[PDB]
Design a protein around this ligand. Structure first.
Ligand code: HEM
Length: 154
């Protein structure tokens, strides 16, 4: 929906923690996604040979993709909602090439929140959680708009 300026400030303050260790966050987020929602792994021809968490933790290539994911998300979040320019290519690849259902963006949003609780206990309270959830919900809703514009049902 629309975040307050206060809420965006909180979102970006938590993001600065992500930016201090991008690869470790990105690795944790993709592995959490694959553990909580294994169906999502099946969509990655690149990774689906990885069978266990331990195997996933040992893939440098998974870590690299985690950086790529978070770099993109970060650019989006820094736009504080004014992210049309960022969402157009992302929606195009994800709807038309990777063919990812929108529901999976809910799953990755859940993984992000989980990893923030795991990595930043004592520094990720109800206020920050609420703000980040709003930002991720806006992102998902706006990607779903872009899927529809491409002619899909996400
Ligand atoms: C925060 C949410 C996400 C962001 C920011 C994101 C971002 C990216 C970026 C930047 C790329 C590389 C460029 C491109 O192809 O667009 C990518 C590739 C990809 N994404 Fe995502 N992604 C997200 C969620 C998801 C989810 C939830 C899935 C599947 C369940 C998914 C599946 C893929 C696949 C399959 C590729 C190609 C990977 C490869 O073979 O190299 N993405 N994503």
């Amino acid at each position: 929906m629309v975040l307050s300026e206060g809420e965006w400030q909180l979102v970006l303050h938590v993001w600065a923690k992500v930016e201090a260790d991008v690869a470790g966050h990105g690795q944790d987020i993709l592995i959490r996604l694959f553990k909580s929602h294994p169906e999502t792994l099946e969509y990655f021809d690149r990774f689906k040979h990885l069978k266990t968490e331990a195997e996933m933790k040992a893939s440098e290539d998974l870590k690299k993709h985690g950086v790529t994911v978070l770099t993109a998300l970060g650019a989006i979040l820094k736009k504080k909602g004014h992210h049309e320019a960022e969402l157009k290519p992302l929606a195009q690849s994800h709807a038309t090439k990777h063919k990812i259902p929108i529901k999976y963006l809910e799953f990755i949003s859940e993984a992000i929140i989980h990893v923030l609780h795991s990595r930043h206990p004592g520094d990720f309270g109800a206020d920050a959680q609420g703000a980040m959830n709003k930002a991720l919900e806006l992102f998902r809703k706006d990607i779903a708009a872009k899927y529809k514009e491409l002619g899909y049902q996400g």
